[PDB]
Amino acid sequence: FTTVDNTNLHTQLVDMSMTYGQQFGPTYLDGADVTKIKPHVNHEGKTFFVLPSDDTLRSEAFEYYHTLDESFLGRYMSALNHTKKWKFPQVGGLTSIKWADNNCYLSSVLLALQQLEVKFNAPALQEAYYRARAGDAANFCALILAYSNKTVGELGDVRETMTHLLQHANLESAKRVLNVVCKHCGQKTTTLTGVEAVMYMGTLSYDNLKTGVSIPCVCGRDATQYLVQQESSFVMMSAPPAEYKLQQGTFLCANEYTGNYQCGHYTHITAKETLYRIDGAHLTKMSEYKGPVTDVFYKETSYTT
Ligand SMILES: C[C@H](c1cccc2ccccc12)N1CCC(C(=O)NCc2ccc(F)cc2)CC1
Ligand SMILES: [Zn+2]
């Protein structure tokens, strides 16, 4: 029994002589890489993981994971070896992660997804996510790491991570139209789809984007950008961390980042009855917040001006 998706098993008969690596190529088993080891006296009838050695495992790996990256399953396994050892407490109603291995940023990603009307197209993601929502999150965390080419123990950036993951999200009907202006110039309409329809870097305030947001121009004096139309279930506003005040009823959730670029700490802020700050296993409550915020999520259905 080999498998690359844990859904389709492929019965195989083993030889005393060689190691799995010999007969199967790169191999695994319950995380325990068993590539260069031989058959047992007990656990035959075992399901093994394997590299798409052949046209059919390749095809099943792709349909499940929606990736052609030959290194993916290996990196995924390695991460799973650590994440399956993580704790995943329910905090303010949501699955979150006990701090370990600089998993901060994954903790914020996971808490924020649980609040967005979002679906994944890769079956591995859809499934792993459903289980994470029920508090079984190791696979899902290890998939996040693998899909964004990070390893356990690195600190990571939440915005970059969402970038990789939302590429695998159902954005197929998301649309964003922005008007651009230059009062020593004319007026340019732009339409954005996929990830950039929901993800904006340059201000934390969705209103600001509605009423116009500025930056140094390309002809003499500054140019403006404003939102003429939005279609999606949410939007994510990001900016380098800056002192910013979050009020109840104004936003859905947010991330704070304290530190510098190289090293620092994320916590997650969500507004229910009141504002909550989730710091892995830890929860605190507050009526209002002013701190270094870097991502703010807003709820949406259809906006037009
Ligand atoms: C939110 C924050 C951020 C985003 C954009 C601009 C920023 C400017 C200053 C400080 C943080 C900024 N992020 C910056 C990168 C952080 C990170 O992954 N650090 C690990 C690392 C370690 C060594 C490096 F040389 C560079 C990065 C994770 C979060
Ligand atoms: Zn101009």
Swiss-Prot record:
Zinc fingers, C4-type class: 182-219
Signal peptide extent: none
Residue ranges of domain Peptidase C16 in the record: 64-305
Binding site for Zn(2+) 4: 182, 185, 217, 219
Co-factor requirement: Zn(2+)
Reactions catalysed according to its record: Thiol-dependent hydrolysis of ester, thioester, amide, peptide and isopeptide bonds formed by the C-terminal Gly of ubiquitin (a 76-residue protein attached to proteins as an intracellular targeting signal)
All copies of domain Ubiquitin-like, residue ranges: 1-50
Effect of residue 16 to K: In strain: Isolate BJ02
Topology relative to the membrane: Multi-pass membrane protein
Catalytic site positions: 104 (for pl-pro activity), 265 (for pl-pro activity), 279 (for pl-pro activity)
Subcellular location per the Swiss-Prot or TrEMBL entry: Host membrane; Host cytoplasm
Domain of life: Viruses
Function: Responsible for the cleavages located at the N-terminus of the replicase polyprotein. In addition, PL-PRO possesses a deubiquitinating/deISGylating activity and processes both 'Lys-48'- and 'Lys-63'-linked polyubiquitin chains from cellular substrates. Plays a role in host membrane rearrangement that leads to creation of cytoplasmic double-membrane vesicles (DMV) necessary for viral replication. Nsp3, nsp4 and nsp6 together are sufficient to form DMV.
Domain remarks: The hydrophobic region HD1 probably mediates the membrane association of the replication complex.
Protein name: Papain-like protease nsp3
First and last residues shown, out of full length: 1548 to 1852 of 4382
